[PDB]
Amino acid sequence: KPVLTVYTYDSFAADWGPGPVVKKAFEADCNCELKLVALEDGVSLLNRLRMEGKNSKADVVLGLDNNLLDAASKTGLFAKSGVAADAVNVPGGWNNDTFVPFDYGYFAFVYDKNKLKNPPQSLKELVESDQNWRVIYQDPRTSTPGLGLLLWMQKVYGDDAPQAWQKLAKKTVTVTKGWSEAYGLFLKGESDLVLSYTTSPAYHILEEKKDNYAAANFSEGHYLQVEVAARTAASKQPELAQKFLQFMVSPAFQNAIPTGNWMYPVANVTLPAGFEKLTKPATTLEFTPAEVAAQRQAWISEWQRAVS
């Protein structure tokens, strides 16, 4: 009967996402009405919450990630999770009293092997090659995968990011606010490549029995994303919010991540047959939450100037 409002992005709460599964699994156990609201894209979730303040109707924000931690905590809108750390297993480890991971992955450009014969083998080639590859990606101001690509490029080019961005802009068909639209245009054929995840091919393999889609493994390595959730300080249902966060890092939840969100679980659950066809990037790239919050505004400012 009591309601637990959870802000999240559209692909999570989608009928085909993990939402429906997690919902009934949480409600079937802990009596209450879990209300998953597909409100904004990853980065936008935070900006919207910062503007709702304590007037926000959210109890939990699901869908932020490792790159937004500093920005989120400095806001003061989140309370401690009350979730035991030992309940989580993530690459590079995880030590945080507020944000609880629920899955992780690696950003990568996906393409159709039946349509793209000689795909790029490094972010550098994709940007500098003379090939006229069509690319689509997300806005770093609204989408985590978008923010991911922004930081990925920063790792690879450093102070040369803007010049690299101008070159990438010439191969850019469009830029969407969220991943869903981006991926849809890709599947419709509007581009040769789209920024997505190393695990995206798994969706097509298991659900459509197709293995023609692939994520290009770049030699520079790939940027790591650890999605997280946290309860709000203004929540009027603290206890429930926290029972949801603990239940999140548990099997009933995690078991729906592989085929729901197409990402690697945070708990040692069994990965669906098919994931083994995927490529685990050797080298992993990541900025500290502090480094991103301190420079993301300037990097985004340079990005938009270079691609418009």
Residues within the interface to ligand TPS (CB under 6 A): 9, 11, 41-42, 138, 143-145, 178-179, 196-197, 199-200, 203, 261-263
For residue 288, say whether it is annotated as part of any ligand binding site: no
Q: Do 230 and 64 contact (CB within 8 A), yes or no?
A: yes
- Contacts with 185 (C-beta within 8 Å, 6 or more apart), sequence order: 136, 173, 174, 176, 191, 194
277, β-bridge pairs: none
Rounded Cα–Cα distance for residues 116 and 233 (Å) = 49
What is d(CA 99, CA 75) in angstroms, rounded to the nearest whole number? 13
- 158 assigned to a ligand binding site: no
Is residue 197 a known part of a binding site?
yes
- In the bound state with ligand TPS, the residue whose beta carbon lies nearer, of 5 and 176, is 176
Nearer to ligand TPS, 11 or 66 (CB): 11
* Residue 203 Cβ vs ligand TPS, minimum distance, rounded to whole Å: 3
- The answer to whether 5 is annotated as binding is no
Q: Is 19 annotated as a binding-site member?
A: no
> Nearest residue by C-beta to ligand TPS?
41
Cβ distance to ligand TPS smaller for residue 200 or 242:
200
Cα end-to-end span (Å), the chain: 49
In the complex, least distance from residue 31 CB atom to ligand TPS, rounded to whole angstroms: 29
Distance of alpha carbon 47 from alpha carbon 133, whole angstroms: 33
Q: Considering beta carbons, is residue 19 or 289 the nearer one to ligand TPS?
A: 19
Q: Is residue 199 marked as binding?
A: yes
The least distance separating ligand TPS from the CB of residue 130, rounded to whole angstroms, comes to 29
Q: How far is the CB of 278 from ligand TPS (least distance, A)?
A: 11
Q: What angle do CA 156, 158, 164 make, to 5 degrees?
A: 70
Distance in Å, CB of 128 to ligand TPS, minimum: 26
Residue 301 one-letter amino acid: S
Render 204-273 in DSSP notation, one character per residue.
Answer: HHHHH----EEE---TT-EEEEEEEEEEBTT-S-HHHHHHHHHHHTSHHHHTTHHHHT-SEESS-PPPPT
Which residues line the annotated binding site? 41-42, 143-144, 179, 197-200
Which residues line the annotated binding site for thiamine? 41-42, 143-144, 179, 197-200
